[PDB]
Tab-separated table of C-alpha atoms and ligand atoms in Angstrom:
chain	number	residue	atom	x	y	z
A	48	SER	CA	198.993	118.930	166.696
A	49	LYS	CA	196.937	116.135	168.178
A	50	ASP	CA	194.271	116.801	165.579
A	51	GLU	CA	196.740	117.144	162.755
A	52	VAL	CA	197.880	113.635	163.623
A	53	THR	CA	194.369	112.214	163.928
A	54	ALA	CA	193.558	113.495	160.423
A	55	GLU	CA	196.699	111.844	159.046
A	56	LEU	CA	195.832	108.568	160.794
A	57	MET	CA	192.326	108.623	159.325
A	58	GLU	CA	193.786	109.220	155.867
A	59	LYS	CA	196.196	106.317	156.225
A	60	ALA	CA	193.367	104.062	157.467
A	61	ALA	CA	191.250	104.983	154.441
A	62	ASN	CA	194.128	104.232	152.055
A	63	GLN	CA	194.799	100.888	153.780
A	64	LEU	CA	191.137	99.963	153.429
A	65	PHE	CA	191.063	100.848	149.735
A	66	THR	CA	194.263	98.831	149.279
A	67	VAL	CA	192.523	95.822	150.838
A	68	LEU	CA	189.505	96.486	148.609
A	69	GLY	CA	191.866	96.378	145.623
A	70	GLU	CA	193.342	93.080	146.785
A	71	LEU	CA	189.954	91.425	147.343
A	72	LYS	CA	187.998	92.837	144.415
A	73	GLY	CA	190.721	93.532	141.853
A	74	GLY	CA	194.252	92.178	142.154
A	75	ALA	CA	193.266	88.753	143.537
A	76	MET	CA	196.318	88.770	145.781
A	77	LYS	CA	197.944	90.871	148.493
A	78	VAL	CA	199.878	93.956	147.396
A	79	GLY	CA	203.176	92.594	148.715
A	80	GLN	CA	202.749	89.291	146.868
A	81	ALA	CA	201.773	91.114	143.699
A	82	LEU	CA	204.771	93.402	144.086
A	83	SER	CA	207.178	90.450	144.336
A	84	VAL	CA	205.684	89.036	141.141
A	85	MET	CA	205.875	92.451	139.423
A	86	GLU	CA	209.507	93.022	140.272
A	87	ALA	CA	210.390	89.595	138.924
A	88	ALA	CA	208.234	90.072	135.790
A	89	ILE	CA	209.231	93.648	134.936
A	90	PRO	CA	212.744	94.243	133.515
A	91	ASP	CA	215.114	96.224	135.756
A	92	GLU	CA	216.049	98.254	132.664
A	93	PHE	CA	212.668	100.013	132.988
A	94	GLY	CA	213.481	101.078	136.540
A	95	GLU	CA	215.882	103.958	135.947
A	96	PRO	CA	214.055	105.753	133.116
A	97	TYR	CA	211.088	105.714	135.506
A	98	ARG	CA	213.243	107.357	138.183
A	99	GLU	CA	214.575	109.903	135.670
A	100	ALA	CA	211.051	111.075	135.038
A	101	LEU	CA	210.219	111.599	138.695
A	102	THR	CA	213.493	113.496	139.133
A	103	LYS	CA	212.610	116.900	137.743
A	104	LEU	CA	209.237	117.191	139.444
A	105	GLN	CA	211.263	116.907	142.631
A	106	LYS	CA	213.615	119.463	141.237
A	107	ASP	CA	212.377	123.005	141.838
A	108	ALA	CA	209.907	122.053	144.577
A	109	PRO	CA	207.143	124.535	145.333
A	110	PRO	CA	206.887	127.289	144.800
A	111	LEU	CA	208.434	127.518	141.327
A	112	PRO	CA	210.869	130.412	140.977
A	113	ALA	CA	209.906	133.187	138.550
A	114	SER	CA	212.249	132.140	135.735
A	115	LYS	CA	210.737	128.654	135.426
A	116	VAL	CA	207.204	130.067	135.528
A	117	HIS	CA	208.186	132.356	132.659
A	118	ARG	CA	209.660	129.359	130.836
A	119	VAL	CA	206.396	127.414	131.048
A	120	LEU	CA	204.583	130.513	129.802
A	121	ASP	CA	207.086	130.734	126.917
A	122	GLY	CA	206.273	127.160	126.009
A	123	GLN	CA	202.500	127.572	126.120
A	124	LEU	CA	201.736	131.145	125.018
A	125	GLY	CA	204.971	131.975	123.181
A	126	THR	CA	208.014	134.027	124.205
A	127	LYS	CA	205.982	137.224	123.870
A	128	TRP	CA	203.278	136.035	126.269
A	129	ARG	CA	203.733	139.245	128.290
A	130	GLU	CA	201.961	141.154	125.508
A	131	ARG	CA	198.787	139.241	126.355
A	132	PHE	CA	198.862	140.680	129.878
A	133	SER	CA	198.676	144.177	131.322
A	134	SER	CA	200.607	142.869	134.347
A	135	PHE	CA	201.676	139.561	135.919
A	136	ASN	CA	202.471	138.785	139.560
A	137	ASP	CA	205.525	136.486	139.815
A	138	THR	CA	204.621	135.426	143.365
A	139	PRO	CA	202.003	132.642	143.215
A	140	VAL	CA	198.806	133.121	145.193
A	141	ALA	CA	197.936	129.440	145.392
A	142	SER	CA	198.945	125.859	144.715
A	143	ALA	CA	197.246	123.401	142.381
A	144	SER	CA	197.646	119.618	142.287
A	145	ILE	CA	200.443	119.694	139.693
A	146	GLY	CA	200.895	123.433	139.272
A	147	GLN	CA	200.562	126.835	140.874
A	148	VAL	CA	198.235	129.787	140.490
A	149	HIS	CA	199.214	133.403	139.854
A	150	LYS	CA	197.111	136.537	139.880
A	151	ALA	CA	197.466	138.836	136.883
A	152	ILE	CA	195.691	141.444	134.786
A	153	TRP	CA	194.685	140.550	131.225
A	154	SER	CA	195.318	142.922	128.331
A	155	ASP	CA	191.658	144.045	128.391
A	156	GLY	CA	191.949	145.134	132.029
A	157	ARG	CA	190.286	142.103	133.638
A	158	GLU	CA	191.900	140.445	136.657
A	159	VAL	CA	192.672	136.775	135.972
A	160	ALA	CA	193.916	133.616	137.641
A	161	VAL	CA	196.670	131.879	135.690
A	162	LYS	CA	197.275	128.223	136.467
A	163	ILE	CA	200.789	127.175	135.480
A	164	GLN	CA	201.616	123.467	135.345
A	165	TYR	CA	204.935	122.310	136.844
A	166	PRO	CA	207.539	121.689	134.069
A	167	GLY	CA	208.297	118.107	135.112
A	168	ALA	CA	204.703	117.031	135.793
A	169	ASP	CA	204.016	115.713	132.285
A	170	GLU	CA	206.888	113.311	131.946
A	171	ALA	CA	206.605	112.181	135.555
A	172	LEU	CA	202.893	111.392	135.330
A	173	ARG	CA	203.241	109.680	131.949
A	174	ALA	CA	206.111	107.498	133.184
A	175	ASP	CA	203.984	106.676	136.230
A	176	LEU	CA	201.096	105.734	133.927
A	177	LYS	CA	203.439	103.506	131.899
A	178	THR	CA	204.606	101.727	135.044
A	179	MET	CA	201.046	101.131	136.227
A	180	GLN	CA	200.048	99.854	132.762
A	181	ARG	CA	202.872	97.311	132.939
A	182	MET	CA	201.767	96.274	136.421
A	183	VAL	CA	198.186	95.841	135.219
A	184	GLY	CA	199.586	93.589	132.485
A	185	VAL	CA	201.379	91.526	135.109
A	186	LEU	CA	198.174	91.102	137.147
A	187	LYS	CA	196.120	90.215	134.072
A	188	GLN	CA	198.526	87.526	132.907
A	189	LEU	CA	199.908	86.109	136.158
A	190	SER	CA	197.399	86.767	138.954
A	191	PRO	CA	194.705	84.063	138.855
A	192	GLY	CA	191.179	85.483	138.949
A	193	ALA	CA	192.311	89.111	138.763
A	194	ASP	CA	189.684	91.625	137.641
A	195	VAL	CA	191.467	94.512	135.908
A	196	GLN	CA	188.665	95.255	133.455
A	197	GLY	CA	188.545	98.947	132.527
A	198	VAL	CA	191.466	99.872	134.802
A	199	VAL	CA	194.007	100.926	132.160
A	200	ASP	CA	191.351	103.081	130.465
A	201	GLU	CA	190.588	104.786	133.773
A	202	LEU	CA	194.303	105.433	134.446
A	203	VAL	CA	194.797	106.886	130.964
A	204	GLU	CA	191.755	109.157	131.263
A	205	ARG	CA	192.698	110.387	134.752
A	206	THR	CA	196.249	111.097	133.619
A	207	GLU	CA	195.125	112.985	130.534
A	208	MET	CA	192.647	114.987	132.610
A	209	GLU	CA	195.462	116.024	134.940
A	210	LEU	CA	197.981	116.849	132.209
A	211	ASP	CA	195.857	118.644	129.605
A	212	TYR	CA	194.294	121.802	131.051
A	213	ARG	CA	192.263	122.320	127.862
A	214	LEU	CA	189.810	119.539	128.810
A	215	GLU	CA	188.837	121.191	132.094
A	216	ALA	CA	188.753	124.494	130.201
A	217	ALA	CA	186.144	123.117	127.756
A	218	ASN	CA	183.958	121.890	130.629
A	219	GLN	CA	184.258	125.290	132.290
A	220	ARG	CA	183.262	127.085	129.069
A	221	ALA	CA	180.042	125.081	128.909
A	222	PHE	CA	179.228	126.087	132.486
A	223	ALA	CA	180.288	129.730	132.055
A	224	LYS	CA	177.963	130.068	129.108
A	225	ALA	CA	175.062	128.373	130.885
A	226	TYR	CA	175.308	130.414	134.097
A	227	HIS	CA	176.175	133.814	132.635
A	228	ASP	CA	174.221	136.480	134.573
A	229	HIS	CA	172.554	133.816	136.749
A	230	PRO	CA	171.137	135.353	139.931
A	231	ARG	CA	172.705	132.746	142.241
A	232	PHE	CA	175.713	131.127	140.537
A	233	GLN	CA	178.923	132.667	139.242
A	234	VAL	CA	181.229	130.797	136.864
A	235	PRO	CA	184.367	132.659	135.753
A	236	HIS	CA	184.882	132.789	131.993
A	237	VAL	CA	187.847	131.037	130.442
A	238	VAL	CA	190.165	133.700	129.074
A	239	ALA	CA	192.731	131.383	127.493
A	240	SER	CA	193.601	127.699	127.511
A	241	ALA	CA	196.660	125.607	126.690
A	242	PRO	CA	197.817	122.118	127.731
A	243	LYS	CA	199.971	123.479	130.594
A	244	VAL	CA	198.499	126.973	131.172
A	245	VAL	CA	194.899	127.930	131.785
A	246	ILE	CA	193.610	131.450	132.400
A	247	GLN	CA	190.216	132.421	133.795
A	248	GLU	CA	188.491	135.470	135.265
A	249	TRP	CA	189.494	136.174	138.844
A	250	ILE	CA	186.790	135.699	141.424
A	251	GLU	CA	187.116	135.728	145.181
A	252	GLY	CA	184.721	135.379	148.064
A	253	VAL	CA	184.670	133.434	151.279
A	254	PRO	CA	185.929	129.900	150.573
A	255	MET	CA	183.432	127.190	151.483
A	256	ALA	CA	186.140	125.583	153.664
A	257	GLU	CA	186.218	128.749	155.736
A	258	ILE	CA	182.432	128.727	156.075
A	259	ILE	CA	182.630	125.103	157.197
A	260	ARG	CA	185.039	126.060	159.976
A	261	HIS	CA	183.926	129.548	161.126
A	262	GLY	CA	180.857	130.415	159.040
A	263	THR	CA	177.777	132.111	160.460
A	264	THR	CA	174.498	130.164	160.458
A	265	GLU	CA	173.250	132.231	157.512
A	266	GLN	CA	176.465	131.724	155.491
A	267	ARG	CA	176.274	127.970	156.086
A	268	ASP	CA	172.593	127.761	155.170
A	269	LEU	CA	173.030	129.921	152.072
A	270	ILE	CA	176.055	128.263	150.496
A	271	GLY	CA	174.652	124.833	151.395
A	272	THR	CA	171.356	125.662	149.705
A	273	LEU	CA	173.226	126.989	146.659
A	274	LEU	CA	175.305	123.801	146.375
A	275	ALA	CA	172.194	121.658	146.684
A	276	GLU	CA	170.528	123.747	143.969
A	277	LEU	CA	173.518	123.579	141.593
A	278	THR	CA	173.613	119.828	141.975
A	279	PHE	CA	170.137	119.407	140.487
A	280	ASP	CA	169.981	122.510	138.304
A	281	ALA	CA	173.062	121.803	136.205
A	282	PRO	CA	171.936	118.502	134.645
A	283	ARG	CA	168.547	120.100	133.956
A	284	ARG	CA	170.075	123.267	132.479
A	285	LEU	CA	172.953	121.944	130.368
A	286	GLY	CA	172.939	118.146	130.631
A	287	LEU	CA	176.027	118.105	132.814
A	288	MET	CA	176.697	117.650	136.495
A	289	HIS	CA	179.420	119.647	138.154
A	290	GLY	CA	180.603	116.289	139.407
A	291	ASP	CA	182.192	115.119	142.637
A	292	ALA	CA	182.138	118.086	144.964
A	293	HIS	CA	184.857	119.406	147.237
A	294	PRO	CA	184.681	122.600	149.346
A	295	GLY	CA	187.796	123.899	147.573
A	296	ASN	CA	185.706	124.281	144.417
A	297	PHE	CA	183.221	126.774	145.885
A	298	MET	CA	182.972	130.185	147.507
A	299	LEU	CA	180.379	132.625	148.823
A	300	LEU	CA	180.497	135.949	146.974
A	301	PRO	CA	179.585	139.324	148.580
A	302	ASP	CA	176.295	139.510	146.641
A	303	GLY	CA	175.221	136.108	147.933
A	304	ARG	CA	176.008	134.110	144.801
A	305	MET	CA	178.095	130.947	144.931
A	306	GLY	CA	181.282	131.131	142.896
A	307	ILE	CA	182.343	127.866	141.247
A	308	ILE	CA	185.945	127.538	140.060
A	309	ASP	CA	186.925	123.904	139.414
A	310	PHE	CA	185.548	121.845	136.518
A	311	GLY	CA	187.880	118.861	136.290
A	312	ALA	CA	185.292	116.293	137.350
A	313	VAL	CA	182.324	117.342	135.197
A	314	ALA	CA	180.056	114.359	134.505
A	315	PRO	CA	177.876	113.830	131.417
A	316	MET	CA	174.092	113.670	131.927
A	317	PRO	CA	172.533	114.179	128.462
A	318	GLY	CA	169.040	113.046	129.429
A	319	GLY	CA	169.181	115.073	132.617
A	320	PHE	CA	168.432	113.593	136.021
A	321	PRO	CA	166.833	110.137	135.509
A	322	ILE	CA	163.179	110.154	136.619
A	323	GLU	CA	163.379	106.828	138.453
A	324	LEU	CA	165.403	108.434	141.244
A	325	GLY	CA	162.946	111.182	142.214
A	326	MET	CA	160.186	108.647	141.716
A	327	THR	CA	161.887	106.133	144.016
A	328	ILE	CA	162.328	108.722	146.748
A	329	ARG	CA	158.689	109.819	146.594
A	330	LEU	CA	157.381	106.229	146.678
A	331	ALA	CA	159.746	105.390	149.554
A	332	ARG	CA	158.561	108.387	151.567
A	333	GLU	CA	154.983	107.132	151.188
A	334	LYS	CA	156.150	103.579	151.962
A	335	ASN	CA	154.338	102.396	148.841
A	336	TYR	CA	156.406	99.202	148.664
A	337	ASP	CA	154.025	97.600	146.165
A	338	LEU	CA	155.082	100.185	143.575
A	339	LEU	CA	158.504	100.985	145.039
A	340	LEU	CA	160.110	97.569	144.599
A	341	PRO	CA	159.160	97.100	140.903
A	342	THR	CA	160.230	100.696	140.209
A	343	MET	CA	163.644	100.106	141.800
A	344	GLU	CA	164.097	96.761	140.043
A	345	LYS	CA	163.198	98.353	136.706
A	346	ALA	CA	165.626	101.224	137.338
A	347	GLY	CA	168.408	98.819	138.347
A	348	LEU	CA	168.583	100.180	141.903
A	349	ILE	CA	168.165	96.697	143.350
A	350	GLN	CA	169.271	93.343	141.999
A	351	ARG	CA	166.716	91.517	139.877
A	352	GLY	CA	165.219	88.150	140.838
A	353	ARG	CA	166.060	88.290	144.539
A	354	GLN	CA	164.139	88.050	147.798
A	355	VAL	CA	164.323	91.575	149.181
A	356	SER	CA	163.947	92.873	152.750
A	357	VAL	CA	161.731	95.953	153.074
A	358	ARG	CA	163.751	96.906	156.153
A	359	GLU	CA	166.918	96.944	154.067
A	360	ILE	CA	165.249	99.055	151.354
A	361	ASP	CA	164.202	101.564	154.024
A	362	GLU	CA	167.760	101.607	155.316
A	363	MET	CA	169.305	102.206	151.911
A	364	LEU	CA	166.895	105.053	151.032
A	365	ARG	CA	166.812	106.692	154.473
A	366	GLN	CA	169.509	109.304	153.762
A	367	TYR	CA	167.444	110.566	150.816
A	368	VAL	CA	163.989	110.278	152.343
A	369	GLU	CA	164.533	111.905	155.730
A	370	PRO	CA	165.706	115.279	154.367
A	371	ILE	CA	162.551	115.769	152.243
A	372	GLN	CA	160.107	114.811	154.989
A	373	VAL	CA	160.482	118.354	156.343
A	374	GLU	CA	160.295	121.814	154.775
A	375	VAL	CA	163.803	122.769	155.891
A	376	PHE	CA	166.195	119.951	156.764
A	377	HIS	CA	169.142	120.459	159.060
A	378	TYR	CA	172.086	118.582	157.570
A	379	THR	CA	174.355	117.646	160.472
A	380	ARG	CA	177.315	115.370	161.111
A	381	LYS	CA	175.258	113.789	163.907
A	382	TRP	CA	172.539	112.834	161.416
A	383	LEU	CA	175.035	111.483	158.879
A	384	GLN	CA	176.587	109.338	161.604
A	385	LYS	CA	173.093	107.980	162.300
A	386	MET	CA	172.757	107.216	158.586
A	387	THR	CA	175.797	104.978	158.831
A	388	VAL	CA	174.186	102.775	161.526
A	389	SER	CA	172.796	99.565	160.010
A	390	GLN	CA	169.245	98.499	160.850
A	391	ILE	CA	169.980	94.825	160.213
A	392	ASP	CA	172.542	93.269	162.540
A	393	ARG	CA	174.114	90.232	160.880
A	394	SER	CA	173.693	88.014	163.946
A	395	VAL	CA	169.922	88.503	163.675
A	396	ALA	CA	169.649	87.716	159.970
A	397	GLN	CA	172.221	86.767	157.348
A	398	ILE	CA	170.862	88.247	154.139
A	399	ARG	CA	172.622	89.054	150.875
A	400	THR	CA	172.230	92.754	150.114
A	401	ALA	CA	169.489	93.931	147.755
A	402	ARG	CA	171.763	96.830	146.842
A	403	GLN	CA	172.900	97.037	143.233
A	404	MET	CA	176.694	96.867	143.244
A	405	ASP	CA	176.683	97.215	139.463
A	406	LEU	CA	174.657	100.399	139.054
A	407	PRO	CA	173.825	101.644	135.554
A	408	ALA	CA	176.086	104.605	134.677
A	409	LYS	CA	173.036	106.856	134.318
A	410	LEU	CA	172.348	106.273	138.022
A	411	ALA	CA	175.851	105.648	139.382
A	412	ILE	CA	177.215	109.025	138.265
A	413	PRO	CA	174.737	111.422	139.896
A	414	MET	CA	174.351	109.228	142.999
A	415	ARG	CA	178.091	109.461	143.669
A	416	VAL	CA	177.991	113.227	143.238
A	417	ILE	CA	174.952	113.506	145.532
A	418	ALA	CA	176.769	111.490	148.218
A	419	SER	CA	179.716	113.883	148.152
A	420	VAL	CA	177.408	116.920	148.232
A	421	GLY	CA	175.333	115.528	151.129
A	422	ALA	CA	178.460	114.950	153.189
A	423	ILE	CA	179.536	118.537	152.471
A	424	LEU	CA	176.077	119.822	153.569
A	425	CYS	CA	176.603	117.968	156.843
A	426	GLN	CA	180.045	119.552	157.325
A	427	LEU	CA	178.423	122.947	156.666
A	428	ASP	CA	175.751	122.150	159.272
A	429	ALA	CA	173.415	123.717	156.701
A	430	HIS	CA	169.654	124.238	156.893
A	431	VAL	CA	168.432	123.507	153.379
A	432	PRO	CA	164.934	123.555	151.878
A	433	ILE	CA	165.770	120.389	149.966
A	434	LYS	CA	162.085	119.391	149.725
A	435	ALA	CA	161.224	122.465	147.625
A	436	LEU	CA	164.395	122.202	145.509
A	437	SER	CA	163.582	118.541	144.866
A	438	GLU	CA	159.977	119.302	143.917
A	439	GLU	CA	161.044	121.940	141.415
A	440	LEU	CA	164.213	120.428	139.936
A	441	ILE	CA	164.148	116.644	140.305
A	442	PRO	CA	162.053	114.752	137.714
A	443	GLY	CA	159.470	112.434	139.228
A	444	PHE	CA	159.744	113.650	142.820
A	445	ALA	CA	156.804	116.108	142.906
A	446	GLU	CA	153.328	114.739	143.630
A	447	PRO	CA	152.038	113.333	140.310
A	448	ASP	CA	148.657	114.917	141.071
B	1	ANP	N1	189.150	132.072	139.154
B	1	ANP	C1	189.900	131.897	140.248
B	1	ANP	N2	189.998	132.915	141.132
B	1	ANP	C2	190.743	132.743	142.228
B	1	ANP	N3	191.443	131.668	142.608
B	1	ANP	C3	191.324	130.677	141.714
B	1	ANP	C4	190.593	130.707	140.538
B	1	ANP	N4	190.702	129.497	139.867
B	1	ANP	C5	191.483	128.780	140.635
B	1	ANP	N5	191.902	129.430	141.769
B	1	ANP	C6	192.762	128.889	142.818
B	1	ANP	O1	193.547	127.863	142.251
B	1	ANP	C7	193.837	126.856	143.243
B	1	ANP	C8	193.664	125.488	142.632
B	1	ANP	O2	192.321	125.397	142.119
B	1	ANP	P1	191.812	124.129	141.326
B	1	ANP	O3	190.820	124.522	140.227
B	1	ANP	O4	191.272	123.174	142.321
B	1	ANP	O5	193.088	123.539	140.577
B	1	ANP	P2	193.467	122.028	140.680
B	1	ANP	O6	194.350	121.808	141.866
B	1	ANP	O7	194.230	121.614	139.384
B	1	ANP	N6	192.088	121.085	140.833
B	1	ANP	P3	192.288	119.945	142.073
B	1	ANP	O8	193.396	118.906	141.653
B	1	ANP	O9	191.000	119.219	142.298
B	1	ANP	O10	192.728	120.674	143.407
B	1	ANP	C9	192.946	127.145	144.456
B	1	ANP	O11	193.715	127.548	145.583
B	1	ANP	C10	191.990	128.245	143.969
B	1	ANP	O12	191.743	129.198	144.998
C-alpha cells in the first residue's frame, strides 16, 4: 500500500532522529564509529552465546503451536494447570510484545484472557541486555564526553518489566481495586500471575483504535472524555498514573464505560498531581505574567536565573491553555499541527530556550503522559469538556475565589 509504506518511512525517520539524538546527547560519537570501537573492545567469544540466545525466539515463530503453549503453562502453573481452568482455547486470540493471548474459562466460570510468554523470550532479552551493558561500558570508558548516566539502570528495569509479568499484575491489582464498580471505568481483575503467565478477567468492547478510524462522533467524544478523566482521576484516587497511553490499552464497553487492560507503564504519583501545574495553566490563561514566571521558576518549569521571553512562555503553554479557554474543546490533528508551529523564528531572534530540559520527576512524569493522551485525543477528533474536568480534578486550576 502507498500508505503502508508512508507509515514505515515515518517510523524509520523517527528512529534515525532518535539515533542522532543518542549520538549528540549520549554516545558522543556516531553509531558507526562507536560500533567499530565496540567490536574491537568486546571479545568475539561473547558473540556466539549472544546468537544462541536469539536463536530459540526465532524458533517457533508466531503463533506458538499448542504443545509449546502447554509447556509454558506447565512451567508456570504446574503440569496440572488444566485443573485451574474449566476450558482453554489452544488457538490464540491475540499477540503480545513477547507472548500471545488465549481466551479461556476459569474454574469458577469466569471468562479470562491468558497471556503466555514465548519460551525463548527470557534468555534472548537477557542476553540482549548483557550485550547492551557491555556496550555502555565501552562508551563510558572509551568515548570522550559520553553521557551514559542512568542508562544501564533504565535497560535493566525495562527488561525486567518485559520479562516478569507479576510486576504489571501488581500494578493492575491496584487499579482493579480502586475502580471496582466505578460508573465510568472498568479494570479487569487479575485472576492469577506468574513470571511468564498472567491471567485476567476477559473484557471486550470496541477498541479505541477502531473508534479512531471509524468511530461515530459520540463514540469519539465519549472515549476521549473518559481517557482525559482517567488521566487526572487516577493520581487523585490512588496516587498512580496509568502512564504513557496507547489506543491498544483502551476500549469502549457497551454500557459506555472505558475498559482499561494494560498496566505495564504505571507511573508513581504519591502526592497526586502537583499543584504548580494547574496553577501555571490558570495564571497563563489570565496572562498574569507577574505571578506566572515566579511560579514556573519555583516549580522548575523554566530554568532559573535566565532572561525569559513572554512570547516563548505563551508558546510553550499554548497546548494546555487553549483547550480550557472553552467549555468543550475540539481536539483535532489540525490544531495539534498548529501547536507544533513555533512563534519565534530563529532568524528574528536567537534566544536560548526558557524550557526546562531537566524537569523534576514529579513534573516530568505526568507531563509526558499528558502529551501522549493529548495526541490520542487529537487522533480521536474528540470533543472534550476538559475545562470542567480540570476544574474538578486538577489541583490549583480552579479559580481560587
Ligand atoms: N482482559 C483482556 N480481555 C481481552 N483481551 C485482552 C485482555 N488483556 C489483554 N488482551 C489482549 O492482549 C493483547 C496484548 O495486550 P497487552 O496488555 O498490550 O500486552 P503487551 O503486548 O505485553 N503490552 P504491550 O507490549 O504494550 O503491547 C491485545 O491484543 C489485547 O486485546
